[PDB]
């Protein structure tokens, strides 16, 4: 018996909703919300391809090596219901953010906003410490971030585990963070270390092109009777020498422990604080920002010293087609530029002088390559970033690191880099 | 030469489609439809945000231990073509479900629904067994499933394999699910682990408020010529003592082997067989419910003897709000509780009693923790659950556990735990 | 103090849009793009659903194994931005595609199309060689592409790398395109492996039911310096014998060495060079293809001698129900089968004859399963392809492969399978 049925008349070409009015938008994604603001969705993304070479210290060889990879491949969903209630899951497909035990997550959080100004925000994010963190990664102006911050990675990092952060803008003239998280390490008993978080800045001025932007960070662990990584490995400005994501310089690779060590056993150190300092200026196109911090990772056990690390980065950038970076007071952040010529787009040159230094009393012999004393790193990051147009940012850096107590296996006290990258954002 | 081109004017403002009237909807994700019902998309997912605290049994140690990590971080994808087929693509961010080599599946199935109310089910998704377990994890009441499941969890998981089920109501009374799964083990031809459900309920009343719910189930599997893990390793509720997904309770978690082994090697048992029985009865806010099950692993070689395992649990629910859990026929299970009040949500108290007991004739000496005869657990799970909205369930429970002839390393027979749920919906 | 508020009205059933005006469409995913083509965005993805049995050669001991696994389970995001600027990324949550690493990406790609004809594409995405290869994964004729591929199946592969390719139609008659890509190896300085791809076709006839398709394909990398696998390991059609995604064959399945070693030293190969040739014709529900293809891996070290190998095959497939395979100029490459009986959908029988040799000369002594000697295999598929509606299709298919100089520890030189497949497409 073959199958049969009467013709059906459907009523075509439009679009409603049962519920309150929607209005949908796409710029490459997608938005979708109800005009009274009680429910959205977006779903977005952002794609950071990038090939670099680089040699000198930033091998074992001092040899050229390259990377090829995705420094970032988020899937960004993020939405409101009940006008008060957020949630935003960025996972990443690179595979740089999180980890296989515990899920490729840039963030996995919920905020309730209905004490706005103030937010109350829960879930795996990254602790707020630092100008140029608190930045999206998709408009950071280098395209790594400084190496003041991998001296102490843990101030501004989920580390796998869950927070609380209460925040809010402050007389229209400053933004306040504080926050609680647990972070993926046990003590003896099983029991996460746990971590505290402060961020104040003073911004009289925060709007694009007009920026006047003082603060102070605080970031304090307890790792009592917790076995752990003390180690500070900078990569310099250079993502390639060892990353996931892609191709990267593998085995010949050079990043370098400058102090700590991979296994501190359970009652080592007790505790972990840096202190850190912000500074922006901006007019027009013309923007200057600078941060200092400051690591004292504090023995517990005798046969173990405090461990030390200070260090600071400067950077100048302007916008040569004459745009602002983006400048908001709740995050106290710098944001994009968004390009007024459409043909040509934006065009950003920029500089970063980068200084870090060492203080591991506990070496207390040389290596092959590492020298007593205080290890000690500069680095330049000078390069162009085109906006070609809101989606679209296509970067070139050159990268030149000279270093101090430490070399590679050739010998190298220096080395230089170039990192190319096409990234887009929907 | 400038790029130039001459002016273009858009229309703008309106949202129509080529096809059939789509409606559209937002609740925090997205849902898309045509309205003759032959098309429909929906983006959803669930964040389950736990941290908890627990001692005594729980850890080796006795002392506490914490964990803070997401229960579950589902993306959630399921959509309508040609009316009849269905598809729902469920995958885990928080890696707490299927597996890296397999893919972090919650649910990877088609259904066929043109013969409704007979629905045909393929890929991979847990069989049906139990009510606790037909209940979508969105909304089963206590934090974590019951204990008795935890002596034979393939009864109802789909251990990354493919399987075949049709289920159907009937009469208006009844729910019936058969099926039959490959389980992803092989035996030594490279040949997987075929099992076979079936699940069968009478529920004359099936009405949020308004519940008398009977049931039985069955489960068996062929394990001939197979190595398989026969360990029963209960958590207790207490998910925190070893789970992915975020921090745990590292190597002073306690999740105990009540019985079975690791290695159970090829022609050690022959198959394995559980039968399970529900009961549920609801009234307006108050329900209770209740299910018994009973497994027997088949010795095959002599040198082998048979285990067995039995397990219960009682649940009393009550909505100090008013509100009834939602109850469906289709896949005869609760469902959520749905707010009326609007300022204070919706708040609801339970407790759980579990008792589990494992008869392994194969313990044939003591260890340092575990005592020849049968081991016991029974524990009592006491908590709130505030449905603050549709999306948002926040919960805190207190879970206690004693056991029988196994204790931790302190010598511990009971323990104790807290955990807390912020639970968000899209 | 009780919460409270004036009540709001809510302007309801509208969907509108801030910008250019939208379409959006639903088959059981979504596409959402402003009717001025400037912006879009679509969510879609795949499901491929296998089970198997096979034995012989398939399997270690001859014996039957089974294989319950999705082939492939797509996540794809694609969309528009400022008219010219495309982005594609589809995960495979199967994990049967990139990898832990480096993200289980089958595509993670930008394109500009400004130049249109000629479009641009940047990121990860497979080279382009083969017509069967270029055909996408949803609507290759047989459940797996051919044996020859398996050659040296980096001529098509991304291998977790970073590319550039060029392409263009020419003439209203032909398809070129070529490219280079970065893979993920490393020479001794952490430089990457790099290779070069070309595709032409000449096709005079280029559309459903009316192709005359002829082409020429050349890949290339240098290998200098660089530790690889260099086998060759044919699954002969039979995927289940060793896959990702579920359960397999485990270890009783045999995907065989042909040739090559699992660590060829650095310095052993100096390059790798294959050429192609494509053939297809099509008459209406009629049509014929097939591919020849020749290696030579050239030695570096005098320790070590070229490996060559060379594999053809031929295909011819009948839409029973009369509809015509899609064919695209633009990529040369086939495409889908439109069924145009909604009741019974579209029904089409395939044949594909593969066959293979692999000529390596650093086999210098039998192994227990392997002889001195070229290696060969030849491979019938035979099956029906099931168009139930442009969402779904289900296949079934018989695979026999037959051997020379190479058995399982059976000693069979002859094996059979059977594959089912279930695939929805949104
Ligand atoms: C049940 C009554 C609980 C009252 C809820 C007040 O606090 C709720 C907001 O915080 C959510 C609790 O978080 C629990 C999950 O763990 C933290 C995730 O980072
Ligand atoms: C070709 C003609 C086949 C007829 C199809 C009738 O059964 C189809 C429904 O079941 C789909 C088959 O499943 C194959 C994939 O493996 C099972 C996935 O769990
Ligand atoms: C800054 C000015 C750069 C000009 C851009 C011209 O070429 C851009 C198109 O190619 C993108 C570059 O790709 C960089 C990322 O690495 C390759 C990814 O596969």
Chains 1, 2, 3 share one sequence.
Do not use: C
């Amino acid at each position: 018996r073959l199958q049969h049925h009467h013709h059906h008349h459907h009523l075509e070409g439009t679009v409603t909703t049962d519920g309150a009015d929607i209005v949908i938008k796409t710029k490459g994604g997608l938005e979708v919300a109800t005009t009274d603001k009680e429910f959205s969705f977006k779903l977005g993304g952002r794609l950071q391809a990038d090939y670099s070479r680089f040699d000198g210290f930033y091998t074992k060889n001092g040899n050229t090596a390259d990377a090829a990879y995705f420094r970032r491949a988020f899937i960004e969903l993020g939405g409101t219901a009940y006008k008060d209630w957020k949630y935003q899951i960025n996972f990443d497909l690179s595979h740089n953010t999180g980890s296989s035990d515990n899920g490729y997550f840039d963030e996995a959080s919920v905020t309730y906003t209905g004490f706005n100004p103030v937010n109350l925000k829960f879930g795996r994010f990254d602790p707020d410490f630092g100008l140029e963190k608190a930045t999206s990664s998709k408009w950071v102006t280098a395209p790594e971030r400084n190496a003041a911050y991998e001296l102490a990675d843990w101030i501004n990092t989920h580390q796998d585990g869950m927070g609380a952060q209460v925040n809010s803008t402050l007389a229209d003239m400053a933004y306040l963070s504080a926050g609680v998280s647990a972070k993926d390490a046990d003590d003896s008993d099983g029991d996460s270390v746990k971590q505290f978080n402060f961020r104040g800045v003073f911004a009289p001025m925060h709007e694009a092109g007009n920026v006047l932007h003082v603060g102070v960070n605080y970031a304090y662990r307890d790792l009592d009777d917790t076995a752990f990584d003390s180690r500070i490995r900078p990569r310099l400005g250079m993502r390639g020498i060892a990353t996931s994501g892609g191709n990267d310089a593998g085995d010949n690779g050079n990043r370098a422990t400058f102090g700590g060590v991979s296994n501190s056993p359970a009652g080592s150190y007790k505790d972990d604080s840096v202190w850190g300092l912000e500074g922006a200026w901006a007019m027009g196109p013309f923007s200057a920002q600078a941060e200092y911090l400051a690591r004292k990772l504090k023995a517990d056990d005798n046969a173990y010293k405090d461990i030390k690390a200070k260090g600071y980065y400067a950077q100048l950038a302007y916008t040569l087609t004459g745009e602002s970076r983006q400048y908001k007071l709740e995050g106290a952040k710098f944001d994009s530029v968004k390009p007024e010529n459409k043909e040509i787009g934006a065009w950003e040159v920029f500089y970063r002088y980068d200084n870090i230094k060492v203080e591991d009393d506990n070496v207390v012999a040389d290596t092959a390559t590492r020298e007593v004393g205080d290890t000690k790193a500069k680095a330049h990051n000078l390069g162009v970033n085109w906006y070609v147009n809101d989606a679209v940012k296509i970067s070139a850096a050159y990268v030149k690191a000279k270093t101090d107590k430490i070399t590679n296996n050739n010998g190298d006290d220096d080395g230089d880099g170039f990192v190319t990258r096409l990234q887009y954002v929907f």
